[PDB]
Amino acid sequence: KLADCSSKSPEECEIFLVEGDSAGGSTKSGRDSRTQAILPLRGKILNVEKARLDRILNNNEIRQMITAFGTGIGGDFDLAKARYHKIVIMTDADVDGAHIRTLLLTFFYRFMRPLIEAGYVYIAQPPTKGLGEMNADQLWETTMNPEHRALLQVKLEDAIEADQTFEMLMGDVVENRRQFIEDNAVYNERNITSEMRESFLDYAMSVIVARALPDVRDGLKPVHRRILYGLNEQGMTPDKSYKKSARIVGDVMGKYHPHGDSSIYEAMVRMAQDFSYRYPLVDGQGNFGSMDGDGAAAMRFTEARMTKITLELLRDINKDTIDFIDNYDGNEREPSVLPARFPNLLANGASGIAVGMATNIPPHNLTELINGVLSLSKNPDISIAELMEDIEGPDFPTAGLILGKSGIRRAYETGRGSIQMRSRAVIEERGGGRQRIVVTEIPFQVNKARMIEKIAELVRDKKIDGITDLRDETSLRTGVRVVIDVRKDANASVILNNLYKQTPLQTSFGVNMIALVNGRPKLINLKEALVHYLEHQKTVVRRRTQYNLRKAKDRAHILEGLRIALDHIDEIISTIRESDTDKVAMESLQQRFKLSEKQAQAILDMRLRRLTGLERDKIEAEYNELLNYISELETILADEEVLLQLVRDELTEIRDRFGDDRRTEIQLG
Template sequence: MADQDIIASSDSGASGIKLAELGHEMRSSFLEYSMSVIVARALPDVRDGLKPVHRRILYAMYDSGITPNRPHSKSARTVGDVIGKYHPHGDFAVYDTMVRMAQDFSMRVPLVDGHGNFGSIDGDSAAAMRYTEARLAKPAMELLRDLEKETVDWNPNYDESLQEPSVLPARFPNLLVNGSNGIAVGMATNIPPHNLGETIDATCMMLDNPDCTTEELMTVMPGPDFPTGGVIMGKKGILDAYETGRGNLTIRSKHEIIEGKNGKHSIVITEIPYQVNRTNLMQKLGELIRDKKLPEISNVHDGADRNSPVDIIIELKQNAIPQVVLNKLYKHTQLQVGWGVIMLALVDGVPRTLSLKEMLHYYILHQEDVVTRRTKYELRKAEERAHILEGLLVALDNIDEVIQIIRSSETDKEASARLTERFGLTDAQTQAILEMRLRRLTGLERHKLEAELKELKEKIDYFKRILADENLMRQVIKEELLEIKAKYNTPRRTQLSAAAKDIDVEDLIAEEDMVITVTKAGYVKRLPVATYRQQKRGGKGMQGVSLKDNDFVEHLFIASTHSYMLFFSTRGKVYRLKVYEIPEASRQARGTAIVNLLPLEKGETISAIIATKDFPEDEYLMFGTEQGMVKKTSMSLYDRSRRDGLIAINLKEDDNLIAVRRVKQGERVMMVSSAGKAITWDESEVRSMGRDTMGVRGMTVPAGVRVLGMEIARPGTELFVITEKGYGKRTPVADYPLHHRGGQGVFTITMTAKKGQLTAMKVVEESDELMIISEEGVVIRTSVESISQLGRSAQGVRVMNVADSDKVCTCAIATEDKKKDGDEDDDADDFDGNETADLNDADDTEVEADVDVEDEVDEAEDEFDETEDDE
């Protein structure tokens, strides 16, 4: 076995060295060690919720008579008894455990009544054990009650000189009430504390209905109750922990916001999360302020006193928003912490992860065993006493003869034998008769004996009924639990919140209106509305944006930082960003290339943009493709996002998404093809479909022809079309008859070879301005009213001079007013591709627009009109 690691001896028999394979020996030795740590050190028993060291401390104090009705005793004496009799480990470990059992900020129901310095929530350590005193707390006596009535098994201590209980009777579910945490070998437990009254109510519910669900249990025990209070955010983590034994909780501090003078606010932290060191928390706050990560905070004070031992006063600067500051504090400090629940405990000496129902089930089994053992013990004692009383009554009935037998006997043994033979008594009865005092011979004593015997017989009958009837036994357990609840219950300290637990980056950002611009070349930026100072109509405006040649602003939105921007691509995908995720830039900056913000594939471009704050189920988006397919889908289906985008519409291999518009009930949809035809149909022609669908035919186009665009044809608007060679016209949408979807439509312009195919369309109003761009980058800007209004069959007029080698490729709208007459109630978040357009001329980057969004936003677009005059 040269290739194996061997511990061996050539004379193993003589030397006593055992031959063993090293790997096997290491495995077996480590398993023994790990099981010793798991069973004897780190994990609590599911029945009494105590680790061995906790159990030994409580029993040592009980055995020494250091009970609540006795004076406090030196902690060093208790520690000495524990390590000398039951727990041969370090004295500091035992003392630290006893200290924690006395801390009301560590234990929901303290089991030790400490006298002296037992530490603080600030992280101060307790005084040395020679200075402090302790005794059992009253609730601890409920864990030890009936210990002398043979209710639990006893084991020899480490040197077999004494006996110690293997588990305590535990008359309330201590594992849930006080929780437990510990790290064993390869496993750990972290059970949160709970409210005593709620836990007892849940146990009683299980006693009444063992098949109750976790949701039903949570109606009486809704969640953990930490001794330091705080707020548990969300209920999913609690439900997961109760159903599976594992879950993640988020605990926040409690606070008050106080408004002071000059508009300044102060945040007072009144409760902090469980097991958070208050001193370390304040040090962290100071570091964040020094590092200017919390610039809104001016100062932090320690406001703790005897009545409010936790208060931390955080003073804010003027105009700071308290909720935003709080969200930053939750993000960067331990004012919010995660708490992983692992409900691991020993069941019959084996570690198991337990659900709430399983924990209560095993506790109830333990109580049934305790009550059964106690009842059997009390039944035996009652029967023994009744047996003696029956013998005494026989002796009293024949007292003269009994006295004569005793007087005439030489010894006790002879008297006992003669009494047994004469009256048929047992040895126990004759012994009691011989020890009976003469005063028991009075008539009054006889009545007492008869009353005691009657009472004992009633108890014996009751004990037998308990042992025979499981329901009665459960009722006994329930009554005793309710008695404990009446004595020791306290109000809940931890508040439960239904709000989501996670802090989004959005929570750290103040909500304000932003101007978002997207250029034709694909540059996007945002800047506050307040950047554009308010002017009267007709003002000169200010420098808006500096763009590359032939680029112009295609979309402009005014939306809250917390609103969503939906970017729809030609490939039929939708990408979602929050407004605050769009980089902020100066007025003159071009912005950030959109390809740096969205994971667009090669050749994929943005064809439509929608701004919205919410996703109502009863509002819809209408999609249009180059091949004439349309689809209507509820906005609620787009209330999610993925890093690489979501499928917004299924497209054929050679098809592209060209337009996405918000549509309301009763509105008309207009589609125009490159063959010069237009079709109008009611939106009800298309039923609502799912997100991952292709849609239905909206317009039939022959081979080689494509749909140029899809718009919502609102009353009073006009259809503008332009050909490749720059010929265009506008026609009222009322001139187009209403058709069913799927047709080829009617001619909207007479096509000729000289004018080329139709290349772009827009639904416009007279107040609009148009930006028209050619393939070679030539851009003109013209007002809609300067273009002739002609009938459907007209050929159009020259709108743009186009070189022979050039063609018109697209057009966009530069809207004068974002809010048209009658639309004053529209929210700024509702602007989309229909209502936004080009704001900048390609040459001088000047912008014309008016935006009416309450006070500061009323005329922001006026400031885009022209470059500011030099002063």
Template sequence: MSSDLPDGPDATADAARVENVRIEDEMEQSYIDYAMSVIAGRALPDVRDGLKPVHRRILYAMHEMGVSSGSSHRKSSSIVGETMGDYHPHGDSAIYDTLVRMAQDFSMRYPLVDGQGNFGSMDGDPAAAMRYTEARMAPVAEELLEDLEKDTVDFQANYDDRLQEPEVLPAAFPNLLVNGSSGIAVGMSTNIPPHNLGEVIDATIHLIDNPDAEVTDLMEYVKGPDFPTGANIVGKNAIHSAYATGRGRLTVRAEYEIDEMASGRPRIVITEIPFQENKARMVERIADDVNEGVIEGVSDLRDESDRDGVRVVIECKRGANVDVVENQLLDHHLESTFGVINLALVDGEPRVLSLKETLEEYVAHRKEVVRRRSEYDLAEAEDRAHILEGRLKALENVEDVVELIRNSEDRDAAKAALEENFEFSTEQAQHIVRMQLGSLTSMEATEIEDEYEDVQAEIERLETILGDENELLGVIKNELRAVKEEYDDDRRTSIIEDDGTVTREDLIPEEDCLVVITEDDYIKRMPVDRFDPQRRGGKGIIGADPKEGDRVSKVFRANTHDYLLAFTNHGQVYRLKTYEIPEMSRTARGKSAVNLLKFDDGEEITAVVGTDEFGDDECITMVTHDGYVKRTCSSEFENILSTGIIAAKLEDGDELVDVTVTDGSQDLVIATEGGMTIRFDESEVRQMGRSARGVRGIDLQEGDAVAGLVATDETDDRSLLTVTENGYGKRTPLSEYRSQSRYGKGLIDIKTDDRNGLVASIKAVAEGDHLVVMSESGQIMRCPVDDVSTVGRNTKGVTIMDVEIDDSVSTVDVLPTTMIDD
């Protein structure tokens, strides 16, 4: 029987090369090699540019093809073919899927590809085939490739060694955080949420200036993830955990509002959905639950979304409890969990990074990029300076140089003669023999000298950058600011607190804000510094956008860390923290207050006081629409239920109008809508319980009603500011209002004729204070108190706010001098 096995000396040599290994060891090592190949080559982004290899290769292929933001669109199939043929040896479907996602504004916070054609939808509709769609780079993507040709990053051979491709892109902004990333590798996965570009750049600059900054410091700039689909993140604790450890679970809640249809039935309108939620599938699941009886009280469900945005309408049955429907939707459909795993490649190895570590790695990358770019530019500038020095030297000896070149046999001989006779370098001599005669004019000589001076200045600048790290960091900061100025936009995702959530007050910046409330109980807060002071008599700017039929009822100042007592027209009082009120833009309507406070029908906030204003023996003093006044010890408001407690018992048709804190030794000034005021000692109003109605404070004329309440004393040098519905007002020293007995008719304070209209509000103001005046339609104006004339009682006043004919002043508050920056 013959054998095919070799024998002889060759067989002995082959046997010597055989190594015996345990099969489990070989399997383990092979699996590790495969896993690392997937981790580094496909699934995880690089911390420096925030891109996976396929994203980077698509952008680089488009860069090489010249498919920039300024060029015409190219067929997606062409881009995919170039990427696959030259750089990414994988299936075309994987490349096209990546290209599509980079073009979807609901997937990328700042899309890197400008797509033309059908690139899919939030309903899960797939993109059209690549032969039908076209694409080009988005402008923001070009910031990632900026200075690529200046040796700013290392290049590596492509898969077949024909071409070179960048290992990483220069990345002029922290793309890993800005656009986020997700991917599943072998044994690990990453899920990094997108963020607001402006916030991330501000945090990066802060870290450059303050290397010892902690995560909590950076969170003053990066409030939280900012999803392209908006919605709300519930709770700050999870955000802090994700930023501090690199891992966290965020609850993302849809944005919706509850309103009434013309028929009076309530409806829930969803306008933003959680990130990566399939809208069509969500609507289908809600419909299934309604049909199966899991969600009760729904009469109709419609998806009215269009190109302008999401709009899913859920109509409730007549008599249905909309709060119950809302809670059922939240439990099953309107909330999702985003699991944060901030895993990225650092020096080729996967690492879970905190917010600070992520930004530190990016700053280190940019330092290397700017250093290498500066070295490249310096070498180019020095080469140019060397040539210019030769040209200047040639101009100084122009006649001899021309004569020498003319007498030379050929160019090589001329170059050799120039090097020997004038000590030109080879590069200088080669340049000189190629010069045209026209460059020997005096004008050309001047231009060469000017260019030489510019090049020397550029060399000096680059040497300074390379020799001083502070200068280098300054370049990085300036370039980041330029990117922010070009691409920054408003935050889309709000961050809210939920009932029962333990908040981290140390993460919430303590700042003064304005809280705006409408009659339909929409509420929001805005930073005070968002409103610059204007001269009196202006129209103001938009401060709220109430829906049709609604109007602004209250604006007041507060600190984000204040506990507020909110008194309503029904005589109830509720307690909430200012930061629980959602912060929103000027033009936003606000969030429904029923999400914060459990109001009854027709109940609205009419007065607010901060609990940190209370002293041991102080009282809450209240006045009603019909002129009743009462004082109740502040200690009776310490334990307030989530459903509120009674603050004052009201007669039918009466409403609580205003509230202030008094210490028992002050005078009360009550003003009416008809322009009357009365001042009396608060001791004339005995302390009484919360359920008491109070005593009469002013004898109102028929048809008149109370407009406001102020507390003062004999040493008070402030003035009483009175503002009318039509935007007129005046200041009168409080000392001009003599004290009377309670329940008198009072004195005339201001004329309430057709020009002025009725009194809208009164406030005690001091020199240097600022007014915040808001109209029913949402216009808001801030102006210095000093702009309002100080006059006597019984006058008309001056224009404070230019109110439109169909609008009127709704509310006024005061920013004291201590809140105003110099």
């Protein structure tokens, strides 16, 4: 791993802790060959304030640094054997780079605290993006070159203060770490604390607001918007043909999302499972996993492409219904949020683990979710207990069962709640006084065979009894189906209701609805959830109708001047011929006909065949049809209750085209 230096007298030495490997062997040619040692960390390291001392003492990066430090840790730290008087921490200049920073610091205050004081702790000044993508000496000259390199020694100033920060930030009290976050939510020396409060604040945020949280409008995280905008743009629409995966990842990684390949493929892969997603936004072709936890074949071996329902996610996008922004480097654009013409958030659900928070939303039945909004339009002052009159509860893709209106009903209420999910099981008598236990629908997010290696574990472990055999017989002809053989005399129902206890045959969805609303992290309710979506349904379908307006009048102006042109044809054709530079002609048609630049230019673009019979006539046939569209579009605008209908019209056309009954059963009791 490490690459060491010739000078074995620490003084003229120093080690660089450099983020990745891509940037690690770059640095392995920029670096001086006799005064500069490199230690490539292989990825985000252990937290030393979360895990106890036997763990710390193990994660390889953690060990690897100790020896390579020489000083020895804890209370054996002889800062004398200190191999380096200048240890540089050269983390990428991204968020996961300041984030890797805090993690090394947390290790260098509790385990080499004298080191910080000593005067060896450093922070190279990488030029701003990305680390890896630099040359070997492009790495020497800005960062490892003493002649030109900008560094940072970490002054531990007030140990009383730091001692208190380091616990809040990397401590086990998630809730402390949030309170700070929420409060600071604005949208040649370096003090160790002056570092953390920023180097973690930026990360805490960007993770919350540009990683692990699904917007409230499209119900989408970024890595998803960017996979569904790219299917969009690359025009791999459902009527067309599957593209290989690594080609869309190729496209998406390039343009919008500078991150690992793995993160993007496995992400679009989920969007592609009839069991993961309630309403799959991807057409998977090729091996795409299975319920046993198996993973889609590698991105080079599969194909995807939009789904019919995905269009509704991006329908009317090009009519200016949402704001585009430059991408990451400013060479491309991307949607800030897609149209989401259909209740996507609650429909498909969500799960993500943040920094301060985490979110968990269940998948609900679209049809149910629609009436919900439908009713929700006709009454801004509606009660959840009523919204729930249209929305029985979530509906998992795994069907399965749900217990009580009660676990369900609090979630929606207050925002957080607990739902007990349970498998579809049946007892059936095999005669001769015998029994057997046949699950056909496990719960949602429940790895099939690991529930079975889980019952396998019990039976061989004599922790539960009276089961003779355990077969998976599941066929893509029967649906899920776990047959459990029961012994004679021994009671099965017993063995059933103990398999709910002891195994995932019964599991619980921890509803906790933190979605990104108005830009920030937010716990919300069923009412709130649809309200802010219905809002984005008003705020799309409106902005469109106005673009159609604009796009409408714009054409009827060009037409106006066009008909005038066909009506005084004979003079127009000579006022051109008798004009040399078309700059002059544009100057004629205007004065003589009371016309406008955009109009006289247009005429000067008219093709001879636009003068035949139909083509002439067709033309004015287009005009009188536009003015119905125009007044209408304005009718639509000058009466809320109309635009509002369009919304209901459309939200209902959807519910009639894609709606599907319920799979999950809500059992009352």
